[PDB]
Symmetry: C3
Subunit: 452 residues, 3 copies
């Protein structure tokens, strides 16, 4: 039986942002969403999130996540940011007075922490009968982490914060993950002896280590060798470094599953995105939100797709697109903009300098050049001439061939198999198999240039 | 006298691809093409490629490479993938029964291996009178490589595969390159004593090391310090890592020859591409296939060119182009698409949101805006107005100035020095120095807006 | 009292460039400009730049920098590139015969050197009463640097150049920064004993170390732990590596100040660029010259802006722009080209496949699609229809709505609240509230397709 507390009530001053720290994103989720997904998979009996100033702006996000994850998540309020030890004390108040399960604590700014690392923690805590088990790791650059102090015995003595450490203690490379498991009674007891006489004038959760050691209680450190899983984010530099590490891992999982990613370093893939076998992804590409790519696609350099579905065997090159679907075998790009509600059929083509918004385009239809399609439905096997505009519902049937430089002034219906001449303004319905024209005849003015 | 065997008959299961492993590409060539180019420069007397399932899909590629490299390359068939030792046995069957030259073996998935490393191998093998010489290297991450086992003497004892190694042997950082030279008699003799009682149930070439050591034969390891040259590719993660290392080396060679590459990490340059002195290459750029760039060019950010020739002093910025030439001093981009058969003269200009396909455009001609040029020939010093379309041969002469929003309905000829008015549909020939028009006159409807 | 000499008269052969080495750029400034900015902040009494061949092409750049930095900078000429010791001798001739201040020497190809490192140097030189103080650092790859030779005592003995070092001395990882402070008398005295009998046949400044040690003079090495600050640039590979290190530091400073940079590795930010709090910068972005970005902007993937001002809350996505301003709340992109003299008002919109050149566009005005705006002034709250061209002054008033496929043949005035029909060629003034039209009526030709 375990209760997990997430400390998320700090002011996040080092982010220098008007967005609460724990709402900053990587790979398609806030740090708080990453942390809650990992814990929810671990499925503890209780899950409590400590919130502070701006609890108004965060608590709703937590409620949405509770639904999505289909479990209860309690919010405990911490009025003033008195320190991580104080935050835990606030967190404990959402538990019953007589709770006897283990208490796991972690921060909202350790967003790679995973369900396995948490389960191992609880497993080592239970195995060694610890009063406190602390996750640690070792880093080439330990700046800003609490340093782990050990006796000659290699026994854990204390955690000393960066601001409080000596120059010589700052060289210690073993760090506090800030992820812990506690016997609850031992935790209550240590928390009531915290004082804030330290460099930050805060009530440090980390002091409980030394306090419990005082009492002869069992204090266990568990080393996490994969440092990233417990890496923290205090500022935007660390946020970007961790986003990059997470992205390499996401790309690697796709590569091992059968996706060619020519250049992992310039391919950003959000966590929910799925990609089919074979699919080749070219450099400078972001696949964002719930984008789904099928098999044997080419997703060409410099493409950004957010919530876009792409079938198998499709080509989507130098394209910027959101909330759109692209059918099997279709060709999009280069230099194509898809706005929400675009649906392009199998074997369809949207070519260079084409933008589509809220339009359905049927199987095998091509819009190859310099055209805007807005709020229109176009049938199958049709061909829209270069440099045309759907001036916003206009319906265009199947096997239609419209001439270059046609404007379609909505609303208008173009029947199946109809043609339009080059340079037509279409303001009225065009019967099936009719040709609609409006351009006047060419006149040549001989020797105009000699004269003028 | 040496015979080189390339083992290329494995199923490549870890690639998770329906394309045979050895056909996956980096920097413009398949791994198999990289390996065969390196060996062909070494010019051994015999060159034998062992192929397996899908030999149908690969053997033709090998025949093409034999021609290109102007030498014979024999294909030996290995019916079932019984292991690397079995593959070598199959390879040896393409040699005469009584062959007496050295036998060099390497894999099809070590694509950075070069002619110099091979020549050094053969040189150390001959110098030390070895029965087997094995190339090794040492790696921070040796996962998946055979580990080199040495006595106290530092003498090579055995190679143990990843799947067969103990946890303690897995820590060994010295690895088997999988590149070997053998005395042929010693090789035949060891191969006939291989058994497949190991973790993969395969006939391991690597066992021949321990077998020859059994027989008191001379076993030599030659350390390759530049690890990349002998790095292997079993999966798409390794393929991308090696593609990135190869690309840094290709960019570095251009930089040292006089090319500014602002950002090597986001500049992909295929092996056959040539680039002139001074040329500045901006980030997010791929230069692919047989692209040739002259001197003092700017190849602007976010450009992809495949088989494109660009003269000296030209600017090619945010451009996506294939099978096209761009003359000296010409300006292309930003946001320009060149489709095959585009030829732009010296000092020509193809501007933003312009696409050209299968058209010749003469010296000093400008197509600056929002225009599609298809299947057309345009003369020298002409100017094509913005937002125009060549509606597909149309021929346009020299010193022509065509007005914005002109459609040219092929086939049509526009004589030298002719003009077109804005908004003309040109369906007939236009004499030299004539002005062609078709737009009707402007009518102003006063107070229309108050009313409607 | 100190005099600083910058050695900038070498031929720069390893750059393989027709542009003098010291004029190659990183982050918006030449190496020589970086070096002179750092020294000018240190504000020494004398500042002397030694120039050689091509002094004609560089001395003017130095004069401009003297003004900008508002101080005197003397140019000393070195006729032939006889070596760094000779260059210093030439530099000293711009000082009075009887100068008694310290002499600081540094090269023009150490462009990260900063005012603090220089001030520390002068401080250690004065503290230890040295005849020479040399900055050193230690590098994993010391290729091409002079190696620091020390006695058992850890005392500095000599500097040995790469070309002159033994294989065993080449393993030395402590290197000469090529940044020095000297007692002037000791420097004059050592320089007069230099000989050029060495591998490069040059007069090495580095020999003065061993010469002064000869004379029992005090020779001090000061170790710079941040190696980059003293890293040198002899070729384009090193230039790009240093440009990348400088760029990571510039991005990091913005991140710590409150700017989200999703991908530092593919975000290039020149040194003078300012960016407001919150602003999110997406991958594949260059912000160049004196670009200024306000707060809460999104500067979307694949954007290059040079000298562009962007207000607060604006969106500038897949945009290529120079010498332009974009007002607060405005939306630009994706696929938008801004040419010099573009001014877009607050809440304005320039959409996909739109190019603007030398035009002012008023508050709240939208040019959303496939349009060229050149040399035009457009008022407030107006809407320019898709696929239109300003055929170049044309003035368009406020609350205007122009139909798709309108050509504006300059010069022309469109009054406030006027409309244009789709497919209008506007060649004359349009009164306020008038509707201007020119397209002929649609004609449908029934059964044309059955027949033709
Ligand atoms: C004293 C302490 O705990 N320091 C640890 C903390 O440092 P660090 O300085 O990173 O701790 P933070 O300031 O990020 O705060 C910890 C977390 O608890 C929450 N919070 C913080 C203060 C508060 O009054 N109320 C509150 O709820 C915040 O949301 C924050 O996410 O994590 C590091 C790893 O990331 C560890 O190496 C440190 O040992
Ligand atoms: C037992 C063995 O050799 N292992 C070596 C092999 O591991 P590794 O596991 O990489 O060997 P692979 O499975 O890649 O097969 C070797 C190559 O031989 C060919 N092939 C393979 C099996 C087969 O039955 N027929 C066939 O022709 C394949 O095309 C393949 O390219 O290379 C590594 C370096 O890359 C070495 O460190 C290993 O010591
Ligand atoms: C002998 C010497 O000094 N070598 C140093 C020099 O090597 P390095 O070989 O880099 O020295 P360079 O060839 O770059 O020349 C030094 C600088 O002085 C100027 N110059 C050079 C030659 C000349 O005749 N006249 C002239 O004015 C050049 O502009 C150049 O920028 O810098 C390295 C660090 O970057 C140091 O590790 C080396 O100890
Ligand atoms: Co923290
Ligand atoms: Co028109
Ligand atoms: Co392999
Ligand atoms: Co130098
Ligand atoms: Mg804090
Ligand atoms: Mg295998
Ligand atoms: Mg030199
Ligand atoms: Mg038009």
């Amino acid at each position: 039986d375990t209760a997990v507390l997430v400390l998320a009530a700090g002011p996040g001053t080092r982010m220098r942002s008007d967005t609460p720290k724990v709402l900053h994103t990587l790979a398609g989720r806030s740090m708080l969403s990453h942390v809650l997904h990992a814990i929810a998979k671990l499925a503890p009996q209780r899950l409590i999130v400590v919130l502070g100033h701006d609890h108004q702006r965060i608590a709703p996000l937590v409620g949405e996540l509770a639904d999505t994850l289909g479990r209860t998540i309690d919010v405990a309020l911490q009025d003033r940011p008195l320190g991580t030890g104080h935050a835990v004390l606030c967190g404990l108040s959402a538990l019953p007075d007589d709770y006897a399960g283990n208490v796991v604590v972690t921060s909202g700014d350790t967003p790679l922490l995973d369900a396995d690392t948490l389960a191992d923690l609880i497993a080592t805590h239970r195995a060694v009968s610890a009063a406190v088990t602390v996750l640690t790791t070792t880093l080439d650059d330990p700046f800003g982490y609490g340093r782990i102090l050990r006796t000659q015995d290699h026994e854990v003595m204390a955690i000393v914060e960066q601001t409080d450490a000596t120059p010589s203690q700052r060289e210690i490379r073993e760090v506090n993950a800030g992820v812990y498991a506690f016997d609850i009674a031992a935790l209550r007891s240590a928390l009531s002896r915290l004082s804030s006489n330290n460099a930050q004038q805060e009530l440090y959760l980390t002091d409980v280590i030394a306090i419990l050691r005082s009492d002869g209680q069992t204090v266990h450190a568990s080393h996490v060798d994969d440092s990233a899983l417990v890496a923290g984010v205090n500022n935007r530099v660390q946020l970007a470094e961790l986003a990059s590490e997470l992205n390499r891992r996401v790309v690697a999982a796709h590569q091992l599953a059968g996706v060619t990613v020519v250049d992992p370093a310039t391919t950003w893939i959000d966590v929910d995105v799925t990609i089919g076998r074979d699919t080749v992804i070219h450099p400078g590409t972001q696949l964002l939100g719930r984008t789904q790519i099928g098999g044997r696609c080419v997703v060409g350099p410099d493409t950004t797709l957010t919530d876009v579905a792409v079938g198998d065997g499709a080509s989507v090159v130098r394209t910027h697109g959101s909330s759109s679907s692209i059918g099997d075998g279709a060709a999009v790009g280069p230099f194509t903009y898809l706005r929400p509600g675009t649906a392009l059929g199998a074997d369809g083509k949207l070519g260079a300098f084409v933008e589509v918004k809220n339009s359905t385009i049927g199987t095998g239809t091509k819009v190859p050049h310099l055209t805007y399609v807005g709020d229109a439905d176009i049938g199958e096997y049709s061909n829209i001439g270069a440099s045309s505009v759907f001036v916003n519902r206009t319906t265009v049937g199947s096997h239609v061939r419209t001439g270059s430089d046609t404007m379609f002034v909505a609303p208008v219906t173009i029947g199946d198999g109809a043609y339009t001449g080059a340079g037509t303004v279409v303001r009225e319905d065009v019967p099936p198999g009719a040709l609609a024209v409006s351009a006047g005849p060419q006149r040549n003015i001989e020797n105009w240039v000699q004269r003028k």
